[PDB]
């Protein structure tokens, strides 16, 4: 029964994954990461302290966010002494944000938090953003009280008018404003206010936010974005960079003005034209054509082969069939591949192998 207990738990876990449909998602994103650094964050519920762990997870989130969203930009804000402090301008450089967070890791948190101040700063920082981008705000709230100079309700209404989206991660309990902020800002959806239940659960919540959020049907904006694909060039002598004005061995050449840049993907400093590589767009393709989840094969029927199609792993004999088939191509797979094919890869080998 112990082995069956694990199997049934896997089925329950697979129950949520069954319902997958290609929802429209905004690949281009503009995130404003807000961290709470107040007296309430000095507690020891999270070892060594809330501030240390949150900063540590923030660095991991930055690494993950830019890895799967190469054509996105992020900004970092912090609440301290009842005021909102800006620590990094919105930019596409992952290193800049990580460096800023590392410096923040030293200063001790103190004072009270001010959501209205943080939201107001986020609203201003997101004002110079193209309409084709999705404006998102990730707030890490730990305090159960908010001290603000003005009316928070007015700011929430302004946030809705600006088509901003807010995600709040709590630490202790539910806050009335956070629920209202996460509800009115997300078309009444109540799934954008999450409270962690332990140290491990917090890691999943940060990882979940990486995936682009689906867009609402009524909030439909379609437009064409002008972009360019620079060609990498190797130079025998170092030359000045158009971005930092420093000696570098070489850089990508913009196809619109021939101005060189250090690293990609970034907007050209001269023609203000977003420069990217073919790989950068390719990564976000899986969010557009998600691989249909595999359905477990009942043991009543007869299996095709005793070994996995993609990894040639003999299926254990052991109650419950250890095989998962793909409806599109009807190819059995072991448990290990399905996790690997839906988390690392995003293409079913069986479907590709089938000729037409």
């Amino acid at each position: 029964a112990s082995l069956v207990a694990s199997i049934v738990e896997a089925r329950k876990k697979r129950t949520a994954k069954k319902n997958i449909t290609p929802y429209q998602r905004g690949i281009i994103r503009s995130l404003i990461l807000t961290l709470d650094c107040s007296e309430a964050m000095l507690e020891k519920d999270l070892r060594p302290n809330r501030h240390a762990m949150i900063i540590q997870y923030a660095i991991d989130f930055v690494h993950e966010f830019f890895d799967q969203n190469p054509i996105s930009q992020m900004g970092i804000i912090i609440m301290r002494n009842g005021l909102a402090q800006l620590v990094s301008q919105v930019s596409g450089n992952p290193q800049d944000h990580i460096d800023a967070l590392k410096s923040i890791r030293k200063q001790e948190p103190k004072g009270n938090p001010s959501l209205q101040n943080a939201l107001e700063m986020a609203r201003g920082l997101l004002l110079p953003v193209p309409a084709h981008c999705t404006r998102e705000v990730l707030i890490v709230f730990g305090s159960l009280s908010t001290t603000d100079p003005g009316d928070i309700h007015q700011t929430i209404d302004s946030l809705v008018s600006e088509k901003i989206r807010v995600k709040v991660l709590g630490l202790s309990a539910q806050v009335a404003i956070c629920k209202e902020l996460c509800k009115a800002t997300n078309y009444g959806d109540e799934s954008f206010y999450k409270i962690l239940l332990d140290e491990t659960h917090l890691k999943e919540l940060f990882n979940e936010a990486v995936t682009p959020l689906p867009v609402n049907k009524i909030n439909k904006g379609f437009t064409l974005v002008k972009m360019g694909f620079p060609t990498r060039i190797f130079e025998d002598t170092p030359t000045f960079c158009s971005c930092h004005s420093k000696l570098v061995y070489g850089g990508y050449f913009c196809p619109n003005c021939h101005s060189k840049v250090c690293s990609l993907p970034t907007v050209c400093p001269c023609c203000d034209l977003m420069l990217i590589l073919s790989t950068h767009l390719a990564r976000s393709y899986h969010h557009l054509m998600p691989l249909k989840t595999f359905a477990e094969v009942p043991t009543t029927e007869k299996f095709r082969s005793e070994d996995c199609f993609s990894c040639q792993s003999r299926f254990p004999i052991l109650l419950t069939s250890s095989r998962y088939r793909c409806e599109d191509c009807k190819q059995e797979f072991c448990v290990d591949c399905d996790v690997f094919i839906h988390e690392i890869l995003h293409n079913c080998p069986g479907c590709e192998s089938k000729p037409v």
Binding site: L144, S172, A173, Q174, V175, A176
Partner: protein
């Protein structure tokens, strides 16, 4: 209330915390065809009723009028108020046995 129960044939007495139900017919001279209390069939527990008999120092706490100005009890109740206010997210309601007891104890906390 006697005229009311005689002039009207059918009367329903309902409330959220009317218990025990046997006493009201005794206190007010009337008879009921049926008297029952319904228990909520909530899937998940929604309210946590708990009773506190002593403070953090293991000292019994009570609101007896004669010992209202008790240095030990006042601190114990004061500690309870502050500690709960730290974890209560939005709102907290405190109910005192009488205005005078509340009036005196609040002054003690202020000093």
């Amino acid at each position: 209330i006697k005229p009311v129960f005689e002039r009207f044939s059918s009367v329903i007495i309902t409330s959220g915390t009317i218990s025990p139900l046997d006493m009201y017919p005794r206190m007010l001279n009337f008879k009921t065809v049926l008297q029952k209390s319904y228990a909520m069939t909530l899937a998940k527990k929604s309210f946590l009723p708990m009773i506190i008999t002593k403070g953090s120092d293991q000292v019994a706490i009570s609101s007896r009028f004669e010992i209202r100005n008790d240095p030990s009890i006042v601190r114990n109740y004061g500690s309870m108020l502050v500690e709960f206010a730290k974890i209560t997210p939005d709102g907290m309601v405190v109910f005192f046995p009488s205005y005078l007891y509340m009036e005196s104890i609040v002054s003690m906390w202020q000093t």
